[PDB]
């Protein structure tokens, strides 16, 4: 059974073979160090004389008690300097700080509408399809992004994003929903009626999640709302990663955010990528400010928006050792890019989502990709459109390009009127033309994304033949 250099459990609280061995010792009211003192005469490790418990972790505590350390007390944590192997699952990400903190008494919030919903993050396969990818949601269900469904909470990799101000968990309370019981009941019916599987210590019930431990506040509009009264920082507010596989994970992350600024390095021409699209859509209070926020955006209005936080530095040019090296792609379903803002979560959706292809034309295809759209919120068409003829938007999601390829024949349509004043009947072979290749269905979505793209903003070989054919008339 491993422990940290201060003989607390993988979970952040004291083990009961300590706390039995400094009770008989007379020691229990003591402080933190001299208990140790005491635990190293009795030859630390082996002072239990049924246990080897190995050093696993190291960490700085408060000097409270041994009897009273929770997670609460604990500031850093990092692997133990001569502990040769991998580590076992720990609270919190190693090289991280730690940070402590009815809503009154925690932010200082004015009404419940200026607390920010945190990103909760699980890699764990999708029962839909077979996937195995990092789904969000709460630490109850999460959603997979590859098809919208709901799954149940599994054992795995585990992330809370970056830190909003004032955060918060919201999570459907059917102690309130139930209307025997109604809103304004007790703590103990809350916690009876949540079904959900706390922590439960003589100190009350907590959750560890994804870096962070979190407790129950209070229930407004019948949710529930927890907050994460521990928290782990590994750099620019991100919790890091625990649970099976996180080591590597965190090997990552530590590489890149553990910095005094994060530095973000495009590399090459800035595309509007999904990279990029989510880091701006951060700094965006609401999905209808970040349609207008991404409408002309180039690399200098990004630059200046993302340093205006204080927490990065964009640069371009090439790919740099521990940079944030954006422009060759990279899955967006990550513990990197594990943005809390509401723009970010709509971001996200958009360029995760895939098609039910079967033989289907692209006018089906599109009904369908319109269809997932709107679920994901009633910006999001007007966001896409926005990218795409505003600005200058790469991607390959299916459902985002069979959306835009579908209304290529009103933008041919339009075009043409533009260029000639008019629509003439010796045109229509060119709409025929496009109609004939929408029963190609997938395989012709590549070839109208650049054909809209070339009319959007006015060569490649799909385009080539599109537009050969218009010179003939
Ligand atoms: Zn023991
Ligand atoms: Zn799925
Ligand atoms: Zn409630």
């Given at each position: 059974r491993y422990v940290d250099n201060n003989f607390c459990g993988p979970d952040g609280y004291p083990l009961e073979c300590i706390k039995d061995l400094l009770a008989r010792a007379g020691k229990a009211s003591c402080t933190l160090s001299e208990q140790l003192d005491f635990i190293d005469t009795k030859r630390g490790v082996y002072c239990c004389r049924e246990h080897e418990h190995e050093i696993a972790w190291y960490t700085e505590r408060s000097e409270k008690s041994?009897?009273?350390?929770t997670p609460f007390e604990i500031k850093l944590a990092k692997k133990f300097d001569t502990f040769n192997g991998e580590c076992p699952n720990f609270v919190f990400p190693l090289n991280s700080i730690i940070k402590t903190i009815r809503i009154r008494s925690v932010?200082?919030?004015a009404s419940p509408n200026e607390c920010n919903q945190m990103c909760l993050s699980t890699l764990m396969?999708?029962?839909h399809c077979g996937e195995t990818s990092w789904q969000t949601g709460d630490f109850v269900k999460a959603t997979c992004e590859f098809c919208g469904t709901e799954n149940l909470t599994k054992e795995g990799a585990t992330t809370c994003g970056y830190l909003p101000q004032n955060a918060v968990v919201?999570?459907?309370?059917?102690?309130?929903?139930n209307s025997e019981v109604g809103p304004e009941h007790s703590l103990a019916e809350y916690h009876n009626e949540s079904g959900l599987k706390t922590i439960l210590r003589k100190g009350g019930r907590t959750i560890a999640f994804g870096g962070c431990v979190f407790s129950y506040v209070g229930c407004h509009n019948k949710c529930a709302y927890w907050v994460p009264r521990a928290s782990?920082?590994?750099g620019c507010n991100h919790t890091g990663v625990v649970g099976e596989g996180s080591e590597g994970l965190n090997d990552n992350l530590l590489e890149i955010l553990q910095k005094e600024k994060v530095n973000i390095n495009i590399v090459g021409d800035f595309k509007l990528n999904e990279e990029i699209a989510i880091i701006l859509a951060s700094f965006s209070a609401s999905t209808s400010a970040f349609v207008e926020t991404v409408k002309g955006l180039d690399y200098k209005a990004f630059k200046q928006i993302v340093e205006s936080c204080g927490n990065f530095k964009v640069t371009k040019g090439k790919a740099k050792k521990g940079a944030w090296n954006?422009?060759?792609?990279?899955?967006?379903?990550?513990?990197?890019?594990?943005?809390?803002?509401?723009a970010?979560?709509?971001?996200?959706?958009?360029?995760?989502?895939?098609?039910?292809?079967?033989?289907?034309?692209?006018?089906?295809?599109?009904?369908?990709?319109?269809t997932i759209l709107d679920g994901i919120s009633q910006y999001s068409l007007r966001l896409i459109d926005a990218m795409m003829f505003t600005s200058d938007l790469a991607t390959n999601n299916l459902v985002v390009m069979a959306y835009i390829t579908g209304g290529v024949v009103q933008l041919t349509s339009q075009w043409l009127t533009n260029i000639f004043g008019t629509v003439y009947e010796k045109l229509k072979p060119v709409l025929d033309w496009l109609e004939e290749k929408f029963k190609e269905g997938v395989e012709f979505l590549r070839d109208g994304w650049?054909?809209?793209?070339?009319?959007?903003?006015?060569?490649?070989?799909?385009?080539?033949?599109?537009?050969?054919?218009?010179?003939k008339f």
């Open positions: 041994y009897e009273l350390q932010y200082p919030v396969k999708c029962d919201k999570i459907y309370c059917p102690a309130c929903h782990a920082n590994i954006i422009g060759e792609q990279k899955s967006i379903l990550s513990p990197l890019y594990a943005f809390a803002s509401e970010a979560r709509v971001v996200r959706s958009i360029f995760s989502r895939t098609l039910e292809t079967a033989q289907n034309s692209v006018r089906v295809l599109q009904k369908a990709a319109i650049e054909i809209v793209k070339f009319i959007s903003t006015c060569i490649k070989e799909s385009v080539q033949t599109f537009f050969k054919l218009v010179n």
